């Protein structure tokens, strides 16, 4: 009788695949044929933020596009004023094993976590003048891969226990949990309106969740190896997944389909970070080839190289206004490119 | 030029730089050990001797030296996704047991784990401190059961010294880079005080080698 369940599931899977393929569709590259390539893209290191003494693992730009928070295994969260390379806050951490960092949209709080299975919330704008722990959100049974501030009072966490959670900072309780991944959820990306989000796990699949509704809506299986990074297109109607297959892929929420693949034969190593531009015309992929690539998203050709890092490019971010792109590698260096 | 407020901001940034420098200097002399093992390998006894959810932490001191031991047995998600975070630990403490040479096979799983973690891209120059727990009872275990279950290539003797030597050389013949890293091996006894002393001596040797490499004097 369980075989009947499996047969129904596989028949539905085949029907979904048939519906996807038989949309009477056309290849993306065909439509983006007669558009002018962006040309050679040259970006210089305007600023180099130094002060970390260990491999940094994540950074996040503030919504003012001036302050950025960076996390490293040396057990320090450093908030930098990118315009003057000034440290404004240095927060020690209870556990030095941190691989996540988020900056609140309002700028009041930050969050960080890692192998300790919690990403605590730090309050920056304190009357006492220091930075103190607001809440210790606990309940995950795995290392937190990424927690992003959905709101000033809500956060979304994705850990290595094949699940994601939505928290409420006031009470520190899991408001909603999302399940369905059969592997360590490695990346989490929020929609521009913070209504939907996308989670990418090690089962070579990505899933789209509604935070207010609380269940999977669309699933994408195009990659081969683990998916390490996902970023939404600025329009919110598409997203890009970087995997360990050395290829990034552009996925369409509108069509539940694969749009483009950015693969070059000279690259055989995975992607640790993916981000877009303000207009979504440039896709910045941070490879562990000690350098970063900038791909013309529409035409799929590589537009430029952002070499100048002495180790694997771990984290990558782009400001909201698109003024600059910041890259952080395992050499404990932050580089601003403009 | 700068105003008063941004000059004060620069002063604050410089002060933060100084404090971070002191914390980094203090933490650069922390002896980091990564405790490993397959299962039922008796590393709980090991951490108990050294001391007196998520990855558990132990901190202690021995002869003016601060040791941080990280036990990661509670995170059974995937080693390939977070094992690179430990690139930089002073040593890896493997605690294979010697009373599981026949029960489920388990010795083969321990050897497979040793191959997986030793011939690893992240741990190339990182030494490994092998611990052979439960030594004091397979002596009387082999008074009934033979070694033929574990090893088809051994038919020599069911005695302590012979079996210990064969297991020693079998685990030693598992690393390919026999120059960039060394595998110190121990025979943990009946709760003897030397268990911490051996770790101290091994980590001092590893620190001396690392310092020689840093100076280029090696």
């Amino acid at each position, epitope marked *: 009788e369980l075989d009947q369940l499996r047969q129904e599931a596989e028949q539905l899977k085949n029907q979904i695949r048939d519906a996807r393929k038989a949309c009477a569709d056309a290849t993306l590259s065909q439509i983006t044929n007669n558009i002018d390539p962006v040309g050679r893209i040259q970006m210089r290191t305007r600023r180099t933020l130094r002060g970390h003494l260990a491999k940094i693992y994540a950074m996040h730009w503030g919504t003012d596009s001036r*302050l950025l928070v960076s996390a490293s295994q040396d057990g320090k969260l450093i908030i930098w004023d990118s315009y003057t390379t*000034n440290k404004v806050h240095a927060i020690p951490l209870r556990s030095s094993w941190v691989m996540t960092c988020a900056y609140a949209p309002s*700028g009041n709080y930050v969050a960080c976590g890692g192998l300790d299975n919690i990403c605590s919330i730090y309050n920056l*704008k304190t009357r006492e*003048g220091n930075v103190r722990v607001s809440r210790e959100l606990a309940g995950h049974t795995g290392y937190l891969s990424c927690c992003r501030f959905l709101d000033d009072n809500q956060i979304v966490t994705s850990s290595g226990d094949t699940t994601c959670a939505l928290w409420d900072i006031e009470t520190g309780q899991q408001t909603t949990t999302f399940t369905g991944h059969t592997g360590d959820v490695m990346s989490l990306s929020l929609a521009p309106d913070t209504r939907l989000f996308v989670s990418g796990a090690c089962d070579a699949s990505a899933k789209l969740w509604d935070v207010r509704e609380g269940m999977c809506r669309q699933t994408f299986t195009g990659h081969e190896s683990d998916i390490n990074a996902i970023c939404f297109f600025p329009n919110g109607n598409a997203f890009a997944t970087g995997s360990d297959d050395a290829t990034c892929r552009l996925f369409d929420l509108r069509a539940d389909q694969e749009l483009m693949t950015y693969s070059h034969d000279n690259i055989i190593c995975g992607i640790t970070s993916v981000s877009f531009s303000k207009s979504g015309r440039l896709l910045l992929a941070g490879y562990d080839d000690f350098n970063c690539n900038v791909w013309d998203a529409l035409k799929a050709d590589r537009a430029g190289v952002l070499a100048g890092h002495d180790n694997r490019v771990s984290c990558l971010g782009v400001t909201d206004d698109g003024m600059a792109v910041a890259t952080g590698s395992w050499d404990s260096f932050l580089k601003i490119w403009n | 030029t700068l105003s008063a*407020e941004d000059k*004060a901001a620069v*002063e604050r940034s410089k002060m933060i730089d100084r404090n971070l420098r002191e914390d980094g200097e203090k933490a650069a002399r922390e002896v980091k050990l990564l405790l490993l093992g397959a299962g039922e390998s008796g590393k709980s006894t090991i951490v108990k001797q050294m001391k007196i959810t998520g990855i558990v932490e132990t901190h202690f001191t021995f002869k003016d030296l601060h040791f941080k031991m990280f036990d990661v047995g509670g995170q059974r998600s995937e080693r390939k996704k977070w094992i690179h975070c430990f690139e930089g630990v002073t040593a890896i403490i493997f605690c294979v047991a010697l009373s599981d040479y026949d029960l489920v096979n388990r010795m083969h799983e321990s050897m497979k784990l040793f191959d997986s973690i030793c011939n690893n891209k992240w741990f190339t120059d990182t030494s490994i401190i092998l611990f052979l727990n439960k030594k004091d009872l397979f002596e009387e275990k082999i008074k009934k059961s033979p070694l033929t279950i574990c090893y088809p290539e051994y038919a020599g003797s069911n005695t302590y010294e012979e079996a210990a030597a064969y297991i020693q050389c079998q685990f030693e013949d598992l690393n390919k880079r026999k120059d960039t890293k060394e595998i110190y091996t121990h025979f943990t006894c009946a709760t003897d005080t030397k268990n911490v002393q051996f770790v101290f001596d091994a980590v001092t040797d590893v620190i001396i080698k690392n310092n020689l490499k840093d100076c280029g004097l090696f």
Partner: single-chain antibody
Amino acid sequence: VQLVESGGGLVQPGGSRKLSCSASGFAFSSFGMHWVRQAPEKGLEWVAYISSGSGTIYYADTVKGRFTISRDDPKNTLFLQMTSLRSEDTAMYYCVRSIYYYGSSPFDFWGQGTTLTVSSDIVMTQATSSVPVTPGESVSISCRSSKSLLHSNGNTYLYWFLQRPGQSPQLLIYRMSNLASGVPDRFSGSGSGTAFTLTISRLEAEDVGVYYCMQHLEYPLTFGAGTKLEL
């Protein structure tokens, strides 16, 4: 947050005294400190300053020399040693905490103050000394600088404080536009280089007092004559 201040009183001219300010409620080590005077029937007068870690120390033009200032982080205290106390330093003294980083609000908290009863600057003018105010109307207070306060980094270093009768001044607006924490939204700051205005919309009780405009472009910090508002 408490800044309790003591050591003032009666000293003859030429005497020596020490003013202590004990801090309890915040991280004294990271905060910079200021000592600010106020004559018995005049406005505020910046006196001294210590940065965090005592790295940089500044003194006013009229007190540099005989006046010395120091801090002790261990017990969270700030000392001002006054010598050669002429019959001009008779005043009411305050200690003001101030943290300096991108987005901070300097001069946010003020001490209660002590009382001493001794026996090339950016002149800033407030055109109004006293003005009647309807308890249900909106009123504007104008400050006028000599040197333009709009710096090259886009910040206008103008601060607006309010002192109620018998209480320490409280920071209303910092950097000419940003309301301080806890300040009701009835207060706004506007204007342009060398011409600034604080607007109070829908004035009510607890708005009477004297409003002071201060510059932070460079030391020495200087204030205005202060505008008195009466219902």
